[PDB]
Chains A and B, each alone.
With several copies, the nearest count.
Chain A
Amino acid sequence: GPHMSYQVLARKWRPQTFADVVGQEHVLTALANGLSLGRIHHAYLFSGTRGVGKTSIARLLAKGLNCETGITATPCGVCDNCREIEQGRFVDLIEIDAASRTKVEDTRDLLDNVQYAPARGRFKVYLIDEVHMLSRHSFNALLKTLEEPPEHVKFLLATTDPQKLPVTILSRCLQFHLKALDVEQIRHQLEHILNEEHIAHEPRALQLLARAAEGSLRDALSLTDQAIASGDGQVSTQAVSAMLGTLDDDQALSLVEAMVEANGERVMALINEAAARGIEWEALLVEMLGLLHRIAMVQLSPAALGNDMAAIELRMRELARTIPPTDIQLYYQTLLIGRKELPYAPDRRMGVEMTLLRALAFH
């Protein structure tokens, strides 16, 4: 009943050492080489995308700069200060949620603790997460602290949209850029996570989850929580097949490929998918028109774009050259007429249906 509260896999499997960070070889190796030696810039800016490890890596630097052993690229395992940072409470690291602290009446006070003595352990070090929300005057206070930083302190920094910071602080800070995870990285990490606790898994579900994650690991973990929920403690292909209605993307090219002939159930299946998905019909037909126009461009130039649909550079080319240009022009006329009259149809689904039927009516 009220027992066994499996908290989120986003929080439970949060890395503890630099060996538990998936991907980002460049940042990990750079900081590992920089920690053995004393050349440490007074401010480390971390930037990336949604849910990669900027906050996790910052926790790792708080782990490393503060230990009984000392500044170590290698982890600590267990030692009081870094032990303390496994959980929330910790004395010489203060995590200013800069989103909740944007005004100077708060951030000036928080930075005013830099001139106090550090707590247990060296390197009074604080992590100002999501710096891009600081006010202009808050940034001025941060700049005045950075230009003459106390030697006994350092402080990390994180964000998601680095373009909003002033050029002065960006130039000062030794920015590390954290890359979006590749599909293989996320897939292998999710495999490891599922194997770690108890949940069986089949590979196709995991490729689907990785593809739908769009690169963020936290996104992959949220979707694996949902997959476990829907699959009743088993991430099989069926729960992720229910997710497939959301992750199914390639739809505009298949209809273009099926327009030039009578494929039978292909058009009906594709229109059913479009209706059950409810994407913008005007945008759907504009994508149709763009594909058809670049096809006409390829007809008069054997390699007109080349970079268009590199995954479909073995099927789109056939209709890019085999189909007569006159038929392509007629199809363009049909789709243009359909778009021009689309909003006045009884429903835009009916309008796109009628455009497809007119296209299939001729050849």
Chain B
Amino acid sequence: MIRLYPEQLRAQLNEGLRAAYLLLGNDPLLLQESQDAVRQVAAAQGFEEHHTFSIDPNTDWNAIFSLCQAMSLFASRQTLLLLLPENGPNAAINEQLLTLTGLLHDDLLLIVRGNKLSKAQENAAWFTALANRSVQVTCQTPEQAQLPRWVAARAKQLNLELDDAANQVLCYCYEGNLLALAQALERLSLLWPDGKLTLPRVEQAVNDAAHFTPFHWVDALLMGKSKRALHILQQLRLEGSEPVILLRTLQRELLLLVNLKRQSAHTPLRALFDKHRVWQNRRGMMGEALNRLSQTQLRQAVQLLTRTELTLKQDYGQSVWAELEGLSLLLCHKPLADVFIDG
């Protein structure tokens, strides 16, 4: 219930165990390595038998068998590692968890692992009853701007030297995909145990395998950088989200931006953003975005976008995903189109 960060969960792990542990937060790899650290700490301590249970609706609780009966040949305590569903559990499972805690033995440990829960799921009967002694901890992957420091810190922990150019190429190639980042770090360490990597082969042992959620796409398109936007779209290949999500995203911000430009003659852009708290990390990134445009520019953007909107859904076009390449690139160096398209 404490709702702390794993940098402190390590501290509570070093001290006396605070009964059941619940580590949450959507994690690429940090959840698994935190689980591994918990496993090794427990193995050093009493609890050694890690029984893996997948918490899911429509799946009966075989954990009661461990809960009601104690181990007989090697007790050695034991730990129940629970895997939560990606949407959270239901009331039946939440109350059966409380029943299990009622069946808890002194050598039993409860570990609940999952993603962020809903408020009712968070404040269920089991969590409420365990709020007296259990702990809660959450973590999330670093952002784009927070990546270089994290990568450098991990490199310094692993006793391998990095460089600014190497960090740049890593944060470009592996942006938010820490599993790939960790594998690349291990590969660069094992390839050359010299301990000096500046830019000799870091690209040779690093591919383009990273996640890219749509919110950053306009962040490039608002500068109108042709090569950068084209490279971002090429990076989006092989993890290709269906076009509808990207289309919804850019229609959202373009409707917001056209409303902003309509109201620009009225109350200034900052106090207008006061209504448009879309948390674009300052609401000022949109402020520098709106600096480079024109009303005719917005017309040329919206015509192509709305033509695509019927180009993929009215007749089910197959090039429409590649059309996202077409629409984003043409806006980069189009101050205003002299009609000739006006879709």
Direct A–B contact in the complex, CB atoms closer than 8 angstroms: yes
Q: Which chain A residues border B227 with CB–CB below 8 Å?
A: 306-307
Interface residues of A in 158-182 (CB under 8 A from B): 163, 167-168, 170-172, 174-177, 179
Q: Which chain A residues border B187 with CB–CB below 8 Å?
A: 26, 30, 176
Give bound CA distance, A163 to B241, whole Å: 12
At the interface with chain A, which of B4-12, B114-122, B333-341? B333-341
Interface residues of B in 199-218 (CB under 8 A from A): 201, 204-205, 207, 209
At the interface with chain A, which of B258-266, B271-279, B324-332? B324-332
The 8 Å CB contact of A304, one of B28, B201, B332, is: B332
Q: Which chain B residues border A333 with CB–CB below 8 Å?
A: 340
Q: Which chain A residues border B333 with CB–CB below 8 Å?
A: 297-298, 300-301, 303-305
Give bound CA distance, A333 to B341, whole Å: 10
Indicate whether A297 sits within 8 Å of B330 (C-beta atoms), given known contacts A33-B191, A174-B183.
Answer: yes
Q: Does A144 contact B (CB under 8 A)?
A: yes
Closest chain-B Cβ to A199's Cβ sits at a distance in Å of 33
Closest chain-B Cβ to A60's Cβ sits at a distance in Å of 17
Q: Does B145 contact A (CB under 8 A)?
A: no
Q: Which chain A residues border B239 with CB–CB below 8 Å?
A: 163
| B31 (CB) vs chain A CBs: closest residue | A171
Closest chain-A Cβ to B32's Cβ sits at a distance in Å of 5
**Contact indicator B334/A171 (Cβ below 8 Å):** no
Give bound CA distance, A34 to B189, whole Å: 10
**Contact indicator A305/B329 (Cβ below 8 Å):** yes
Give bound CA distance, A87 to B298, whole Å: 66
**Contact indicator B204/A25 (Cβ below 8 Å):** yes
Q: Which chain A residues border B335 with CB–CB below 8 Å?
A: 300
**Contact indicator B179/A170 (Cβ below 8 Å):** yes
**Contact indicator A30/B201 (Cβ below 8 Å):** no
| A168 (CB) vs chain B CBs: closest residue | B32
**Contact indicator A26/B204 (Cβ below 8 Å):** yes
**Contact indicator A33/B190 (Cβ below 8 Å):** yes
Closest chain-B Cβ to A320's Cβ sits at a distance in Å of 12
Indicate whether A147 sits within 8 Å of B52 (C-beta atoms), given known contacts A167-B28, A304-B226, A305-B333.
Answer: yes
**Contact indicator A177/B32 (Cβ below 8 Å):** no
Over the window 169-212 of chain A, the binary record of Cβ atoms lying under 8 Å from chain B Cβ atoms (1 yes, 0 no) is 01110111101000000000000000000000000000000000
| A179 (CB) vs chain B CBs: closest residue | B207
Closest chain-B Cβ to A281's Cβ sits at a distance in Å of 15
| B334 (CB) vs chain A CBs: closest residue | A297
Indicate whether A26 sits within 8 Å of B226 (C-beta atoms), given known contacts A174-B183, A297-B333.
Answer: no
Q: Does A329 contact B (CB under 8 A)?
A: yes
Give bound CA distance, A246 to B319, whole Å: 23
Interface majority SS (helix, strand, loop, mixed), chain A: helix
**Contact indicator A306/B226 (Cβ below 8 Å):** yes
**Contact indicator A293/B330 (Cβ below 8 Å):** yes
Give bound CA distance, A127 to B186, whole Å: 23
Q: Which chain B residues border A332 with CB–CB below 8 Å?
A: 340
Over the window 221-241 of chain B, the binary record of Cβ atoms lying under 8 Å from chain A Cβ atoms (1 yes, 0 no) is 000001100100000001100
Q: Which chain B residues border A171 with CB–CB below 8 Å?
A: 28-29, 32, 179
| A48 (CB) vs chain B CBs: closest residue | B207
Q: Which chain B residues border A144 with CB–CB below 8 Å?
A: 52
Q: Does A290 contact B (CB under 8 A)?
A: yes
| A328 (CB) vs chain B CBs: closest residue | B340
Q: Which chain A residues border B338 with CB–CB below 8 Å?
A: 329
Over the window 295-317 of chain A, the binary record of Cβ atoms lying under 8 Å from chain B Cβ atoms (1 yes, 0 no) is 01110110111110000000000
Q: Which chain B residues border A306 with CB–CB below 8 Å?
A: 226-227
Give bound CA distance, A147 to B191, whole Å: 26
The 8 Å CB contact of A172, one of B32, B180, B193, B204, is: B32
Indicate whether A30 sits within 8 Å of B191 (C-beta atoms), given known contacts A174-B186, A297-B333.
Answer: yes
**Contact indicator B226/A34 (Cβ below 8 Å):** no
Over the window 71-103 of chain A, the binary record of Cβ atoms lying under 8 Å from chain B Cβ atoms (1 yes, 0 no) is 000000000000000000000000000000000
Closest chain-B Cβ to A215's Cβ sits at a distance in Å of 14
Q: Which chain B residues border A263 with CB–CB below 8 Å?
A: none
Interface residues of B in 40-94 (CB under 8 A from A): 52, 54
Q: Which chain A residues border B204 with CB–CB below 8 Å?
A: 25-26
Closest chain-B Cβ to A14's Cβ sits at a distance in Å of 25
Closest chain-B Cβ to A280's Cβ sits at a distance in Å of 10
**Contact indicator A30/B190 (Cβ below 8 Å):** yes
Over the window 130-148 of chain A, the binary record of Cβ atoms lying under 8 Å from chain B Cβ atoms (1 yes, 0 no) is 0000000000100010010
Q: 6 shortest A-B CB distances, which residue pairs?
A: A304-B333, A301-B333, A26-B205, A30-B191, A171-B179, A177-B207
User: What are 10 A-B pairs at a CB distance below 8 A?
Assistant: A25-B204, A26-B204, A29-B191, A171-B179, A293-B341, A296-B340, A303-B333, A304-B226, A304-B333, A306-B226
| Chain A interface residues toward B at CB < 8 A | 25-26, 29-30, 33-34, 39, 140, 144, 147, 163, 167-168, 170-172, 174-177, 179, 283, 286, 290, 293-294, 296-298, 300-301, 303-307, 329, 332-333
Given known contacts A25-B204, A163-B238, what 14 new A-B pairs fall within 8 Å (CB)? A26-B187, A26-B201, A26-B205, A33-B191, A39-B190, A140-B54, A144-B52, A170-B179, A171-B28, A174-B186, A286-B319, A296-B340, A301-B333, A304-B226
